Amino acid sequence: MKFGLFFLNFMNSKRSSDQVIEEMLDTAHYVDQLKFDTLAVYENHFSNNGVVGAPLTVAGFLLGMTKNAKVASLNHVITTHHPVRVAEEACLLDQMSEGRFAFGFSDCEKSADMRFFNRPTDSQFQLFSECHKIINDAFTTGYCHPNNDFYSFPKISVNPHAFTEGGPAQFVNATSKEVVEWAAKLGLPLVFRWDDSNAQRKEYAGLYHEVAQAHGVDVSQVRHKLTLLVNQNVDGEAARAEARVYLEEFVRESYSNTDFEQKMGELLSENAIGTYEESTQAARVAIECCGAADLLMSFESMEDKAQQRAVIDVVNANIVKYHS
Amino acid sequence: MKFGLFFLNFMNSKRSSDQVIEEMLDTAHYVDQLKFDTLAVYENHFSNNGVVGAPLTVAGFLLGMTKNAKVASLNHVITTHHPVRVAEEACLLDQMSEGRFAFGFSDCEKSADMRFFNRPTDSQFQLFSECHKIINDAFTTGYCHPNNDFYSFPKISVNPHAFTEGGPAQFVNATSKEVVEWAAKLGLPLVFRWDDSNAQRKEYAGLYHEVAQAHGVDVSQVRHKLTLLVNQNVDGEAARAEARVYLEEFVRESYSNTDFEQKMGELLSENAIGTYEESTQAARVAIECCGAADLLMSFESMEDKAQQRAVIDVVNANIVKYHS
Structure with a gap:
């Protein structure tokens, strides 16, 4: 198993945008000396729940x-x-960094961003897939020439050409059955979302495999990723309290019609939140349900910088003792 | 007077894109510890004469x-x-770097690029200033709320808020009389192009001054920038011939045959190209013609990496003695 960190960069009444961005940079610097494999940036627009709207620029x-x-x-x-x-942009990051950039992409999760950037909400899936076909051409041929209802232009060269052969590695977010099935047929890895339930992830996991099994695609060398929130307090009840408030607004903004108490109750017990033991047990369960090979954790909900770094140092110690 | 560098990142057949990027990053690293003030990135698309299509991704x-x-x-x-x-994007750079990013922007010169991106060709300049009022609004207030022919959506918060009061410093390319006058009415500093004649840069400097004087704008603390190409060689014919190869393709793609040979002669005699003395006299004449207070230089045309470093070193020695 490989491990990594991901940044949600949420802001609330106690932590402003300048602060969350400054904390992200300190952690990247710290963790860069450790055994963590990957650092990932989350994208959000127009709300307190995620301050980074341009992940590629922050990745640069x-x-x-x-x-x-x-x-x-x-x-x-x-x-x-x-x-x-x-x-x-993706090829630029690939070149300047010499193969250290990874392309995690996604379909549109919020409809208010679709009806904003004025893209047809009726042909969203066809658009998304056509967009990928064009990106993928560029990655693999350095050129792209589309001839369809969304994008029609001549043969252009996309500079600079990729550094890594075939373009930077890719992985798609498991946002819908349609996307998973789509990812399955191409052999692209998925990243399971932390805001999803264990039940929902096992379903996606199953579907990817049946579709893959059916279309005769080799999925034994594919590494799925799972994102999870980690908050370890010596008092597991405190941990759940602190994470509760972190998530408070996110659940109202994105999960407006599920029932607040239910979802908050589920995110809280299914994510690595609690005492060391609870936090840990939950992790194993989550990984068994989806068969993720890589684990990306977010330690941002812990406000105390001393505590956060302590918990980070432990995860890192476990990686050395048990995963070398 | 302040001095800096800019990267054209042109490529050909005896040079690849993997190569010019590697060379920008090395030069950036050497120069970062010398007395050069600013490093600037040029943007271009689907052509050899400019491999960077995303300057803000590179700036990061x-x-x-x-x-x-x-x-x-x-x-x-x-x-x-x-x-x-x-x-x-710009606000992210401003926050992450703690105010070290400067926003040089520009208008769209090619009608072909307008069609490519679905913008209305004939409305080019109106679309340009509406885009700009939206960006400046975000810089100065953190929210934007347009209501015009191009964009109309309700009020949104643009995260993260600027780090520098008023957003990062701005400047605009003197590409037309229209833009120059527009810039003058706003009190924005210009960047004069290396590829224009002195007569033209002179014309732009005068027009700016007139429009500024007439609208009662105080352009006393406004420092215009000038970009120049530098190729110094103990042999004045060697430098002019090396630069000629660097430019040849650019002159044909851009200045078609507006007598390819007249434009070429001019570029080579007006830029800081030749022996040290020729090179320097040419720089003086250029500054006089436009009143630029800051100078950005490109040393890329010099293929010999040791010869290039020697010139950069001498240029820096001058800043130290005569401009400290």
């Missing part, structure tokens, strides 16, 4: 600032951008 | 690996982008 900075970690965008939403530019 | 990398120099986009074309996306 982290890349030029660190020496070991691989840096990845965790869920760059491609449907709301021009394919050719996403490829231009 | 450069800012993360440098400690002393300011990094700027020299000509980010905003007309073909969604203004909310640019403001989001």
Whole structure:
């Protein structure tokens, strides 16, 4: 198993945007000396729940600032951008960093961003997939020439050409049955979301495999990733309290019609939140349900910098003793 | 007077893109500890004469690996982008670097690029200033709320808020009379292009001054920038011939045959190209013609990496003795 960190960069009444960005940079710097494999950035727009709207640009900075970690965008939403530019940027990061950039992308999760960037909400899946086809052409051929209802232009060259052969590694967010099935047929790895339930992830996991099994695609060398929140307090009840407030607004913004108490109750017990033992047990359960090979954790909900670093140092010690 | 560098990142057949990027990053690293003030990145698309299509992605990398120099986009074309996306990017650079990013922007010169990106060709200049009012709004207030022919959506918060009061420092490319007058009415400093004649740069400097004087704008603390190509060689014919190869392709793609030979003669005699003395006299004449207070130089045309470093070193020796 491989481990990594991901940054949600949420801001609330106690932590402002300048603060959360400054804390992210300190951690990248710290963790770059350790055994953590990957550092990933989350994308969000117009709300307190995620201050980074341009993950690739933040990935560029982290890349030029660190020496070991691989840096990845965790869920760059491609449907709301021009394919050719996403490829231009991704290939630039690939070149400047010499193969340390990973391309995590996604379909559009919030509809208010679709009806904002004025993209047709009726043909969202076809758009998303056409966008990928164009990016992927560029990655693999250095050129791209589309001829369809969304993008029609001549044969252009996309500079600079990729550094890593075939373009930077890719992985797609498990946002819908349609996407998973789609990812399955191509052999692209998925990243299971932390805001999902264990039940929902096992279902996606199963579907990916049946579709993969059916279309005759070799999924034995594919490494799925799972994201999880980690908060370890000596008083597991405190931990659940602290994470509760962190998540408070996120659950109302994104999960407006489920029932607040239910979802908060589920995110809290299914994520690595609690005492060392509870936190740990939950992790194993989550990994068994989806068959993720890599684990990305977020330690941002712990406000005390001393405590956060302590918990980080332990995860790192376990990686050395048991995963070398 | 202040001095800095800019990267054209042109490529050919005896030079690859993997190569020019590696060379920008090395030069950036050497120069970051010398007396150069700013490092600037040029933008271009689907052509050999400019491999960087995303200067803000590159600026992020450069800012993360440098400690002393300011990094700027020299000509980010905003007309073909969604203004909310640019403001989001620029504000990120401003926060992460703690104010070391400078926003050089520009208008869209090619009608072909307008069609490519679905912007209305004939409205080019109107679209340009509306985009800009949206970005400046975000810089100065943190929210934007347009209501015009191009963009109309309710009020949104653009995260993260700027780090520098008023957003990062801005400047604009003197690409037309229209833009120069526009810039003059706003009190924005210009960046005069290396590829224009002295007569033209002179014309732009005068027009700016007139429009400024007439609208009662105080342009006393406004420092214009000048970009120049530098190729010094003990043999004045050697330098002019080396630069000629560097430029040949650019002159044909851009200045078609507006008598390819007249334009070429001019570029080679007007830029800082020749023996040290020729090179220097040419620089003096250029500054006189436009009143630029800051000078950005490109040393790329010099293929010999030791010869290049020697010139950079001498240039820096001058700043130390005569400009400290």
